[PDB]
Amino acid sequence: ANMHQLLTELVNRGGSDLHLTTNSPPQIRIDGKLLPLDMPPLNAVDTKQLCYSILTEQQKHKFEENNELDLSFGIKGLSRFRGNVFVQRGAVAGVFRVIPYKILSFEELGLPPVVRELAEKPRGLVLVTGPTGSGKSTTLAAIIDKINTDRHEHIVTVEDPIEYLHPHKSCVVNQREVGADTKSFKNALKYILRQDPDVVLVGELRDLETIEAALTLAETGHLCFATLHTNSAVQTINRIVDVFPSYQQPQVRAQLSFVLEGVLSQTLLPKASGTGRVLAIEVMVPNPAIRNLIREDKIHQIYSQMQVGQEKFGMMTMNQCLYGLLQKRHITMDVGMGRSPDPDELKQMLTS
Amino acid sequence: MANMHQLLTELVNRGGSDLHLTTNSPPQIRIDGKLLPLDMPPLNAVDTKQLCYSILTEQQKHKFEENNELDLSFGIKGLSRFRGNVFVQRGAVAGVFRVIPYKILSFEELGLPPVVRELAEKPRGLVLVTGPTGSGKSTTLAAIIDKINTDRHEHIVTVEDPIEYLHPHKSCVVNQREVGADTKSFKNALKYILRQDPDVVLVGELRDLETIEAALTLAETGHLCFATLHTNSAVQTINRIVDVFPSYQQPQVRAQLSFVLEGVLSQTLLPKASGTGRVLAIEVMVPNPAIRNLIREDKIHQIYSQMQVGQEKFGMMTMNQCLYGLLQKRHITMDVGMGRSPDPDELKQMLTS
Amino acid sequence: SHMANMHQLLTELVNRGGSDLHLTTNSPPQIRIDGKLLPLDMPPLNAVDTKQLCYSILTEQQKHKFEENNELDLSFGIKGLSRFRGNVFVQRGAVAGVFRVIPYKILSFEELGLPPVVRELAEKPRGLVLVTGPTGSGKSTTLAAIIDKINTDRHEHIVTVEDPIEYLHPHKSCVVNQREVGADTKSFKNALKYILRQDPDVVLVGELRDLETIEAALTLAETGHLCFATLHTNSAVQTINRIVDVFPSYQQPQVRAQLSFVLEGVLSQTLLPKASGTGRVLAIEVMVPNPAIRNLIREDKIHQIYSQMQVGQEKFGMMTMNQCLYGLLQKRHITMDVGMGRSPDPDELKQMLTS
Amino acid sequence: LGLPPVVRELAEKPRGLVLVTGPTGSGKSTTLAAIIDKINTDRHEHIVTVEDPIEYLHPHKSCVVNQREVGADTKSFKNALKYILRQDPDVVLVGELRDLETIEAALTLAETGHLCFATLHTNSAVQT
Ligand SMILES: Nc1ncnc2c1ncn2[C@@H]1O[C@H](COP(=O)(O)OP(=O)(O)O)[C@@H](O)[C@H]1O
Ligand SMILES: Nc1ncnc2c1ncn2[C@@H]1O[C@H](COP(=O)(O)OP(=O)(O)O)[C@@H](O)[C@H]1O
Ligand SMILES: Nc1ncnc2c1ncn2[C@@H]1O[C@H](COP(=O)(O)OP(=O)(O)O)[C@@H](O)[C@H]1O
Ligand SMILES: Nc1ncnc2c1ncn2[C@@H]1O[C@H](COP(=O)(O)OP(=O)(O)O)[C@@H](O)[C@H]1O
């Protein structure tokens, strides 16, 4: 009955994570920063009692065998949660994440209209990138949900774990969870071409084999969605090419020039109001000039090409996005400057 | 049990640096660099085993008997924490014990340049602190961790073998996992670290292939990762990390390294010209756009050329540039500066201009 | 009675100054004196004899281990006599054994024929000192004399890693810890993995078998410690080349730079039969690095180091092998054939004789 | 399929190694099915295919056609190829030349008077 109250406080306060460890009060991450609750500090008896209060008997066994445990659980009327229990300095510790279920609209997410146009693409590779917790899964869920609403096609997702659930609308939606429904990303992608897909979500471009799978899907007539942890379009494109040996990079660059349809690099920044976060996003939509630049190995010039395609194609550099957020007073100058990849350009952009 | 308490108490009270326990000698304490025997009868093999085992857990006893080697740390309430090494010689247990101070020195007390303070403010990336064993790496890391703890409202996780410096919660939540007790291994701790909502992670030495991938993944997914190696320069550090991997996977490591590297600090402690104490010599590499491309393009030899002229703007500093400054302040001798220069000819050119 | 024979055979080995006792079937017991085997005046042994004699000095666990593998290395003491290193094996279906003497008494520098510059090496605060030569060329005896001088004079921590431990060093002014590979520590690599956490001042690492041991020895010497190691090389230049050339070409520049800073002495030894026909006398090449030699190492001009050694005798206590053979020849300790048979350049030694 | 006339003449070769290469989904299996079907139609020989998985089925025409699917009919390419010389083949499809062992099987089949078909993921004759 105490663990219930703590998870209730986490939800009510709009927090993302609950942390339980000795010699500190419970702490909740809100808008990316930890805030301690107005409670006495926990001891080792407390952390074990609190964490064990949400475990099954079999789960207590596995944790004591390894001093590690991953799990998920639900609290009726509240939310499901992702938990990790571990041991530090001889005492139990726990971290508990909230599992969103409701898909927000493109405008609630702060996504510009061009992202809505990406859900209509018949084939190609669309990459959504950024750091952990930069909105990638929510953006993807909005795109996938629009396809589910609008098309009569087959969507297959491979996820680790599944985050957002897509009940069938006009599409048939099959969602495979790594570690339960399928052994691995590699095994799921081995059979995906024999599963008659139209739209496939493959997750992060972790290694060479998954990149070849996404390029093959995109060039064989499918719309393929994937993620990377990179922070810009140029940085994203380089990270796909540079994984391959020098001798095979020309083909990958040629493949990317044909199948790439969009790169979205996101980051959530604290709002100037002090409550909540706002999306900063760089949007690159390839035009003929950029596709040629990829093939000719002149990737360093793509940023300059993005600078002049805003009105026509819906492109937007990070700095142009930061410029709009600064003009609307959604973020502070220090936050905007802190994320600008070129503060001198943004300063020029602000005073021009 | 209550005897080992007394020997460690005498070690601290007497200002010793190290306590030595071995057979056919009384306990000896190193004072001002030289060993002094305590006024006690010589120890036998029963004594050394009992004394060393009195400060061990059952897990630690088993692991020592499995390997005949053991590093560990422990605390004596009201006195101090200590680092221990237990080993076997001539069929008998032996032990050496160092003191671990409660107070973490500041960047200025440690002789660290202002760029090290700015590394403690990095919101993401990979920072490497390198050098041989006992070259000051843990002391520098403790200063960095403590500043983040003071200044940020974030989650710091350390995996250590063993834990040396303890970081009670300040503004951060700090969790410290000791290998062999809190967690089975580095591999196991890093397998779950990504589900523990960390912001800053200390992973220890990049001792094998699997830990580097864990450290690279942590750094590229938006976390600040600190790690150590045994190397003496930025180029040796960068080369050592990529080349340990099979040739076909080095491209990904180079792309990853070019993206996540935020600083490499290579340290060595040198004797002070006064003859008492040591002074820090440090090579600092801070990646600029030019350097990140060279890592990505497998042009490591050109990384060194970029470092000689970026000193004033970003706080970068080659070892030779640091040695030049130590020589100008007359903190070190010519033999020491030349004896640690990776290119004495370059240092000669800087001196005679 | 079997034990009483093994004791008498091992006692005879010590009183007659033999180095090794050999027991095998169809031969009498034989003892090695000054490198050459001599049979004792006894009937030849059979398989019953060799098994009983060798087993008389083994523990029950050692007999069991021997019977599982047909191999056994061990050390043991005979109260009032000496300690010994034994190996028992099987040949032609019968037990055989070899037993070496481990002397209790370390001889002094002058008794061993070591020049005074070797005494000064025991006073070095840090660096790498290499003692090289073939098997049984006196390397361990020289190292024990140096370590004994450190043990006597300093209040520091000496750690040895040995395969196996030969000379035992009681604590004198130093604290001496000696780790035997295969019993005290799993391997040289594992012992060296922890040596920096054991607060050493002086470390003996044994033979520079592999890259990891060379890197460990260079690190010890770079971090302010005095490190002793051995190789099987016959000259200073050959020794330096052996260390550098085991590394890949791309990392050899650093090794040469490292060696040039930390190297403090190279001793290459060989024991030669005396002219009188009894005993052996030490011939030694001694290299003590000066600023000129350290540069030759960094510049990859290794083979030019010998010319520097020819002229550093009076100033730095240096000495080439040929300079040593000259002194043994003028004092008539060795014959002309023995001295010439070992000169790396007999024509140079010839010129030194006629001058 | 848009294959030039020289491809039909390759289907008449009595022996040797024929490689059909390209990236995934570039038509390789379809081209190979056209070649095998002509052989099945034209020859009185024994065709064995090893496939992971089987993509095109060939009912017997003038040839005897045996098709082994990895993971069901046979444990692996390695296991199927160890016995193929003892199965009296004339034409063999071995799939992708993924490792050194499979290449040696294809070169040996092609050298001992058999017609061997295999694929690679290379993009040109020289690269292949
Ligand atoms: N564009 C966005 N605008 C507003 N809130 C967002 C946005 N994206 C994500 N969020 C919220 O912040 C959290 C982080 O999003 P997430 O899907 O986990 O990104 P990632 O998968 O990259 O970690 C989400 O749970 C969501 O509630
Ligand atoms: N810049 C420094 N100035 C003075 N003392 C230092 C300095 N750096 C390290 N030390 C001292 O060195 C000793 C051991 O350092 P340590 O953390 O073990 O380095 P490492 O783990 O890399 O070998 C510590 O007691 C520390 O006080
Ligand atoms: N300089 C020396 N002078 C006289 N006798 C020596 C000398 N060095 C060694 N001896 C004797 O010769 C024997 C063989 O030498 P040893 O220590 O086995 O050399 P190594 O270390 O190369 O194996 C020793 O037992 C020792 O008693
Ligand atoms: N010459 C061709 N012309 C048009 N479509 C083709 C052709 N060859 C194959 N296809 C179709 O393209 C898809 C992929 O071809 P596939 O035979 O699977 O090539 P691969 O075995 O190299 O991956 C198939 O489903 C097929 O129907």
Residue numbers in the entry:
A (entry chain C): 2 to 353
B (entry chain B): 1 to 353
C (entry chain A): -1 to 353
D (entry chain D): 110 to 237
Study authors write:
T4aP polymers can be rapidly depolymerized at the base, resulting in fiber retraction. Adjacent packing units adopt one of two conformations: open (O) or closed (C).
Therefore, to crystallize PilTGm in the absence of added nucleotide without reductive methylation, we extensively optimized the buffer (see the “Methods” section). This structure was approximately C3 symmetric with alternating open- and closed interfaces, similar to the methylated OCOCOC PilT structure. However, small deviations make this structure pseudo-C3 symmetric. These nucleotides were likely carried over from Escherichia coli during protein purification. The isomorphic low-occupancy and high-occupancy ADP OCOCOC PilT structures have an RMSDCα of 0.6 Å per hexamer. The three OCOCOC PilT structures described here are the only examples of PilT in this conformation determined to date.
